[PDB]
Structure formats: structure tokens, C-alpha cells
């Protein structure tokens, strides 16, 4: 799984600044495929749930192009090579009202590198608000 959690949500449900931690991404040993393999363009990003359905907002930043990577394990290899973990920082949400159970910052896949991301979703196995085991 991919473990991330928000440690502070400053503001209101519809206008918030999140402080977050993406703490750990466990090895990918079950053969899960990259859900955006074969798209013309796909990014893995740090992004947040923007709607009640969990679709992506404006990403904090993009980590890598991944549309040529067939498996989720290959995506993990590229993310862990290019970013030291834990990934920590802030991002912002302005849009639909989200309660704490609807807030989440994590690793999204998406075709766009900036702007609201209706086709962006958390990568498979993303856990929001749950700490990893020691
Ligand atoms: N930077 C955008 C954030 C949009 C979002 O919630 O993804 C704004 O403040 O309008
Ligand atoms: Zn948002």
C-alpha cells in the first residue's frame, strides 16, 4: 500500500491548506498494472482529493511521466528513485466542501500536469489517513 495522511487542515472544508506526509510505499509484489499505461501522456503527481468522489485537484507537483511503464511496481521504482521518502509539505484546496474523511493528499496518476484533474485518481493501494506499520 501507499500510506499518506494530513497532519493539519487549516481553514474551512472548501478553502483549506493541508500539511501532509506521504510516508511509505510498500513493495509491489502482486502484479498490479499501471492504470495509465498506454495513455499518450500520464504523470504521477502529488495531488489531493478535490471532490466527494476523490478525483484530483490542482497537483502540488508532478514527479514523473509514467505512461510507458506497464506495471505499478515500475511506477514505484521511478517514484522512489526520484523522490526521497517521506514526501512532506503543503498543498491547497479551494472547491467543494470536504470533511476530514474526504480530505487526502497522495500519489495520483493523471494526464495533465497542472490544473484541476477530473481524470486523476490516487494510485491503486493508496491509503488515506492510515499510518504504516513500523
Ligand atoms: N490553487 C487553486 C486550488 C484548486 C484546488 O482545490 O485544487 C485555487 O486556490 O483556486
Ligand atoms: Zn482542490
Author numbering: 25 to 158
What does the paper say about this structure?
MrpH is a two-domain adhesin (TDA) consisting of an N-terminal receptor binding domain (NTD) joined through a short linker to a C-terminal pilin domain that attaches the TDA to the fimbrial tip. Although MR/P belongs to a well-known class of adhesive fimbriae encoded by the chaperone-usher pathway, we found that MrpH has a dramatically different structure compared with other tip-located adhesins in this family. Unexpectedly, MrpH was found to bind a zinc cation, which we show is essential for MR/P-mediated biofilm formation and adherence to red blood cells.
The structure of MrpH153 was solved to 1.02 Å resolution using single anomalous dispersion, and the structure of the longer MrpH159 construct solved to 1.75 Å by molecular replacement using MrpH153 as the search model. The two structures are very similar, with an r.m.s.d. of 0.45 Å between 129 Cα atoms. In both MrpH153 and MrpH159, a metal bound by three histidine (His 72, His 74, His 117) side chains was found. Similar electron density, consistent with the binding of a carboxyl group ligand, was present also in the MrpH159 difference electron density map. No tartrate was included in MrpH159 storage buffer or crystallization conditions, and tartrate did not fit the density. In addition to the carboxyl group interactions with the protein, which are the same as for tartrate, there is also a water-mediated hydrogen bond interaction with the side chain of Asn 82, and a salt bridge from the Glu main chain carboxylate to the guanidinium group of Arg 118. The ligand-binding site together with the crevice extending from the ligand-binding site across the positively charged top surface of MrpHntd might allow MrpH to accommodate an extended ligand or receptor with a carboxyl group for binding to the Zn2+ in the metal binding site. It is interesting to note that MrpHntd was thermally more stable in the presence of glutamate, but not aspartate, glutamine, or asparagine, indicating some level of specific binding to the glutamic acid side chain.
